[PDB]
Design a protein around this ligand. Structure first.
Ligand SMILES: Nc1ncnc2c1ncn2[C@@H]1O[C@H](COP(=O)(O)OP(=O)(O)OP(O)(O)=S)[C@@H](O)[C@H]1O
Ligand SMILES: Nc1ncnc2c1ncn2[C@@H]1O[C@H](COP(=O)(O)OP(=O)(O)OP(O)(O)=S)[C@@H](O)[C@H]1O
Ligand SMILES: Nc1ncnc2c1ncn2[C@@H]1O[C@H](COP(=O)(O)OP(=O)(O)OP(O)(O)=S)[C@@H](O)[C@H]1O
Ligand SMILES: Nc1ncnc2c1ncn2[C@@H]1O[C@H](COP(=O)(O)OP(=O)(O)O)[C@@H](O)[C@H]1O
Lengths: 271, 562, 548, 91
């Protein structure tokens, strides 16, 4: 509208060419400004046809995501599960009641993938924060100790307790992480072994070794597969709960899955 | 040479060590990073009430980048402090700000995605128009520039949320204020900077006392800087006391000295002299109120508890309601109290409940709702108490206002809360509410303690403290009452040099006439006036009296004479 | 030093002494140098009325600098002023950029100084300021600062206020007597402490527009210059300044003297110059006002609470109009509020206006909003007998404690006002039943706190000639545009009495009755001829009416 | 409403609050079961709920504690034990 002014002279030089259809001029503008700037100038608005674009539903947002679930999966070196897509397309409509559907859904998936890639970095979350906190309490107890005062006696006696009882949890989280990191050698090593068993069944059938054919098909190979299954799990691709963690960190409504840290608190709420 | 005269380098500034050592807030830095590392629409905006450290997070991110503690795709990005005050400033022509903005954008997008940008107070981005701060909107929603921002709640809502199609390209990071423990941590972290600036020393007890007082007495600003300002103020005052004046470190009571030097609250640890005055209270208050030994002890004990350190910090400093016969000294006791702990009789806030016999007249002490005549003016009582948060509220003769005004005090008491028109909140936590009455009128203590019950409600009588009953005027002590009145009169006779020689029989006849059993000592000041002041006025402008003469009085058989 | 053409220095010219020493106000300097020595929220701002010494304090600090007494942190740091009326649409921001860049590349702590910066603040100095390289010391007034630095600022978090209200009489006297020799060589006449103190007190009391430290110097220098020009008396004195104050305000040098004895002794016919007869009432009221300001009555009471009633048209109001004229120097001061609409129970809230948010709130009450401004009025109360017996409670509260409460929440003060409760009771009784009716109708104890309750004595059938005579002396001024004089004749003048009294509204019509007659009966002669500006215009009493 | 058996725990809670508020001046109390049950025995008049108990705690402990505290002899640190008497309770 106001291309160059000083008294209207510019911005309507294309008003003559529009009518004869010389130029085609496809354009897209928001809805609460088409009646704030253009509609005020109904001499020019007349040359425009409107194509109302309604917001899609969850069923179509799921499809949009399923199609777009490659660019992010590539830009970040991670993988994405379809459960994440569905859970995002549902929670983004249930909770974030301020924006519209095709976008507030994609944002959750994108942030989840970004966080996951940031965790394949040196250390995962919930341990880096504890070690930073331990270093803080250390640098604090070191400089509060040299207090030629008396009011610092009972104030420092608890800081030692807190430092020790957070360092304990640091060491425990460290040990559990080392366990879970050393667990992905066997489960997979067996396969490194299970693949060897598949080569063995190949060669059993090469040599006419029927006796080994089934011993590998119904014995060794499936037995190794069953060994991996052993106990059903109670971190290389996003899941339908990192979405919940993002929707909890933003619009601080808590919507996780009660990750065993507080279910005792809920069952204790009365007392 | 485009973003060289419209921008500095915050990263190089942090490399030169000239920034402050942020302490804590790892959650928000991690959130800002995992937002700034997205694929499209990567622009976080730090939101939160003003003063809580919305820039400190950005300096923290800069320091972390310089130190090298960030993920793989965030190293060596050199965040830039952009500014628009020096782009829209000098331009008087058509299309001149556009060339500068386009030069800046072009210089950004020529280099690779390693010029992460930072506009502070970006509520100054919607103007510049006359089609400005709007051409910059295609680049935003494609991940070309990063544009870390920082804006207050109010300015955000007022300036951006009116432009929805632009607010979409942003992400909010609610930076809530920290608690007392985190504040103590931050203060202990920053201690050394001030300890070096001012050549003094600062004690950890002083830091703790600052972080605790700045939360209980200044309830209009926010913590992470509301606390630091006190430490700075006290360090500066100690420096000035050291210099220019021919046991050199701040203490945990200098902070109380500051936080009492403004806001008027006497918060402290009972420095000397003050304790002598408090111990010497019942008698020091007796020189203005004779009798009522039961009441003075109660108010004195209230003040004693409140200032000694044993009293619920969230409830008023007392909510007494004393009532009794007419003309006994209730309002006068309240005024004498206010004169005791202020030495300013006109520094209390008395409201006359005798006016509020009408229902709707309550609006004077509350305000009016949004959309009505007097809205931006506020409420009388709330305005008077929002400043001077140490007064002595009074409710003269609260028996007239029909039983609806009793439903505002009902929650003024027991919490010290009140909400005016604008939706604000005020604190009555360190005032002394006092509300007289005249129930009874002759009846015994068990005939007036029925009037109280049948007039008010249980939910009300349960709120306020002891219901003091006032005795009747003893027929003897009126001599001392007349003594007080003559002392006040002599004090009025000080511009001249007159004195009085009041005789004992004159004083006796005075205390004898004008104390009728139904109205107490009320018809005494007017009698003193009409029997001394006017008689002297007719006797001074017409000679025969001059300043210096120790005027005596007589007990002539008729009305009193000189 | 590249663009130092919109900036003046304070330490350079201090190295010569072209400034004035600022003895006094040594607290403010310490406060300022303390604020400027912090780490955050430095660079204070001086807040006070105009011509109070804002520039005086900063110059005193500059001189203490050039001498050297402050902490060595602030030592060896100069100051530079700025004038904004030289910068000012556009290019003001360009020159702002130039000067700010100059300060920035100066690479030091060269303090600035920006007078009345409420025209500057905007967003161009905050990125410069929240970095710690420049130090600006500004100044403005209180309400103005409350305007430009509170609504559109968001910057008040980096500005520290400093208050300088006003010096007192004793202080500006010291200021004057310090700043005396400079003029004794500029003109050079002589100076007297009597003249100095007279200037101070008289300016403070009567020049109620400007303020003290510059107001006193203005008058002193003006009188000195006038007495140097007069040689076209080698000293200045109290009269030598009272003459100037009289020439300035309009009030002559006479009344500008002792205001107790020579005033309370003027309660004589100076009233009777406007009122006629009723000398008893004038004497009673004069005694009441004399004894009231003695200095022994209680400090919370109206300056007078008397009432007068009886026959109308005798000049009941005229007494009050002359009374306010003599005391408060104006007859457009009394405020008449009729007690007629106040015959209903609810309408008593009209003269206050109770709630915020109801019909009458912004207009305020009839009584208070006309008293809280001009707290020197003389309130009148017509037909006090018809007012409902609830306003009398308000009146009680007035004349039992000199304060009242409006609806806005304010407190109005009544300790130096005068109440007057007119009426019309006593139509049949002379002095016997009028007092009984006044006792019975009103509450007989409310009357006790009143002063004398005098009744105006009727007009003598002879003593209408005096009122009509003042009337004629007045109307003689009417046709001063053509200098046509007028005639007098006892038959004609007394002819007005028996035909203009009409004893139900005194001499209400006695102005119009005669003015329309004489004026519009001669107005045709004044266009045809028959008169010129020496003619007595002899008007006579024709057989029936007043022709010429 | 409340039962006299339920006010004992309320007394415990009020005393915990008062001790936590006193820990700012590094004091604490040692209350004997005589006084602990005496206070609840003064939780009378089952019409005003449980606020009378709070005003009682104030009137019976806080005034005397302040009176001692600002008159020396109770210098910061050492704890004071409260012990019941025939009618009131002394420190
Ligand atoms: N976590 C923190 N670590 C160190 N200093 C902090 C921290 N939080 C706040 N501060 C200090 O507290 C003050 C806060 O100032 P800023 O955060 O710069 O103001 P702001 O947060 O931008 O608020 P506005 O909107 O600009 S008024 C500064 O002195 C900071 O150094
Ligand atoms: N013990 C006392 N000491 C000093 N003055 C007293 C005492 N008892 C009464 N008076 C005087 O009695 C007069 C009335 O006191 P007020 O307190 O103002 O009346 P009041 O208590 O408000 O009674 P009501 O119900 O409001 S009329 C004042 O002049 C007091 O000085
Ligand atoms: N304590 C003082 N010592 C010496 N001179 C003073 C003192 N106070 C005031 N003055 C003189 O009174 C004059 C006051 O004028 P200004 O300094 O312009 O006033 P201001 O404080 O700047 O406020 P404005 O702008 O005039 S309303 C100065 O010229 C001083 O010479
Ligand atoms: N005593 C008087 N002295 C001078 N003028 C008087 C006197 N009595 C009456 N008047 C004249 O009467 C006019 C109107 O009388 P006024 O007092 O206004 O009426 P009312 O007394 O009924 O209120 C005055 O303007 C004045 O001209």
């Amino acid at each position: 509208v106001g291309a160059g002014a000083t008294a209207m002279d510019a911005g309507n030089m294309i008003k003559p060419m529009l009518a004869r259809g010389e130029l085609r001029l496809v354009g897209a503008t928001t809805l609460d400004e088409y009646r704030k700037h253009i509609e005020k100038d109904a001499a020019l608005e007349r040359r425009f046809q409107q194509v109302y674009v309604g917001e899609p539903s969850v069923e179509d947002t799921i499809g949009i995501l399923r199609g777009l679930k490659d660019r992010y999966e590539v830009h970040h070196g991670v993988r994405i599960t379809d459960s994440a897509l569905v859970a995002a397309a549902t929670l983004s409509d249930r909770y974030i009641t301020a924006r519209f559907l095709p976008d507030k859904a994609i944002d959750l998936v994108d942030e989840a993938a970004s966080r996951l890639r940031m965790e394949i970095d040196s250390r995962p979350v919930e341990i880096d924060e504890v070690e930073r906190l331990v270093r803080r309490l250390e640098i604090e107890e070191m400089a509060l100790s040299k207090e030629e005062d008396e009011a610092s006696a009972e104030r420092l006696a608890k800081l030692r307790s807190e430092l020790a009882d957070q360092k304990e949890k640091l060491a425990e989280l460290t040990t559990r992480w080392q366990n879970e990191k050393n667990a992905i050698e066997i489960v997979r090593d067996l396969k490194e072994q299970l693949e060897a068993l598949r080569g063995e069944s190949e060669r059993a059938e090469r040599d006419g070794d029927l006796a080994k054919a089934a011993e590998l098909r119904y014995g060794r190979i499936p037995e190794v597969e069953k060994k991996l299954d052993a106990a059903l799990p109670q971190k290389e691709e996003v899941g339908p709960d990192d979405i919940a963690d993002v929707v909890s960190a933003w619009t601080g409504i808590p919507a996780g899955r009660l990750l065993e840290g507080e279910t005792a608190k809920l069952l204790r709420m009365e007392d | 040479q485009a973003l060289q005269k419209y921008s500095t380098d915050l990263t190089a500034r942090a490399r030169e060590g000239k920034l402050d050592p942020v302490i804590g807030r790892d959650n928000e830095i991690r959130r800002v990073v995992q937002v700034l590392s997205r694929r499209t629409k990567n622009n976080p905006v730090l939101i939160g009430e003003p003063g809580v450290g919305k820039t400190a997070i950005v300096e923290g991110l800069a320091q972390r980048i310089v130190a090298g503690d960030v993920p793989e795709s965030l190293r060596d990005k050199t965040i830039v402090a952009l500014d628009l005050g020096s782009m829209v400033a000098g331009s008087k022509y058509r299309g001149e700000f556009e060339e500068r903005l386009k030069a800046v954008l072009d210089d950004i997008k020529n280099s690779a995605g390693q010029i992460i940008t930072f506009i502070d107070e970006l509520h100054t981005i919607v103007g510049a128009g006359a089609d400005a701060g709007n051409m910059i909107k295609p680049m935003l929603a494609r991940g070309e520039l990063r544009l870390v921002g920082a804006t207050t709640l109010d300015e955000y809502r007022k300036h951006i949320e009116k432009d929805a199609a632009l607010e979409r390209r942003f992400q909010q990071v609610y930076v809530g204020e920290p608690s007392v423990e985190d504040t103590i941590g931050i203060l202990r972290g920053l201690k050394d900077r001030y300890e070096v600036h001012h050549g003094v020393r600062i004690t950890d007890s002083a830091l703790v006392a600052a972080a605790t007082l700045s939360d209980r007495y200044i309830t209009a600003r926010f913590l992470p800087d509301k606390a630091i300002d006190l430490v700075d103020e006290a360090a500066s005052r100690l420096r000035m006391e050291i210099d220019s004046r021919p046991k050199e470190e701040v203490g945990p009571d200098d902070i109380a000295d500051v936080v009492s030097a403004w806001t008027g609250i006497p918060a402290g640890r009972l420095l000397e002299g003050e304790t002598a005055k408090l111990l010497r209270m019942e008698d020091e208050l007796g020189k203005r109120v004779i009798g009522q030994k039961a009441a003075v002890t109660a108010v004195s004990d209230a003040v004693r508890r409140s200032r000694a350190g044993v009293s619920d910090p969230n409830r008023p400093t007392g909510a007494f309601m004393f009532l009794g016969p007419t003309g006994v000294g209730k309002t006068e006791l309240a005024k004498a109290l206010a004169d005791f702990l202020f030495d300013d009789e006109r520094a209390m806030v008395r409201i006359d409940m005798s006016e509020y016999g009408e229902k709707h007249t309550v609006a004077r002490l509350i305000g009016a709702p949004p959309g009505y005549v007097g809205y931006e003016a506020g409420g009388q009582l709330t305005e008077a108490v929002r400043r001077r948060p140490y007064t002595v509220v009074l409710f003269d003769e609260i028996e007239k206002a029909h039983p609806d005004v009793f439903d505002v005090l009902l929650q003024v008491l027991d919490e010290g809360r009140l909400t005016d028109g604008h939706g604000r909140t005020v604190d009555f936590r360190n005032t002394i509410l006092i509300l007289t009455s005249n129930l009874g009128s002759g009846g015994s203590a068990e005939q007036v303690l029925a009037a109280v019950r049948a007039t008010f409600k249980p939910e009300f009588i349960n709120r306020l403290d002891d219901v003091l009953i006032f005795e009747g005027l003893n027929p003897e002590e009126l001599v001392r009452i007349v003594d007080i009145q003559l002392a006040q009169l002599g004090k009025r006779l000080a511009q001249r040099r007159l004195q009085l020689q009041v005789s004992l029989p004159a004083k006796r006849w005075l205390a004898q006439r004008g104390f009728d059993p139904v109205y107490g000592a009320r018809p005494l000041r007017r009698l003193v006036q009409q029997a001394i002041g006017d008689q002297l006025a007719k006797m001074l402008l017409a000679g025969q009296v001059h300043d210096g003469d120790t005027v005596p009085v007589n007990v002539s058989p008729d009305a009193d004479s000189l």
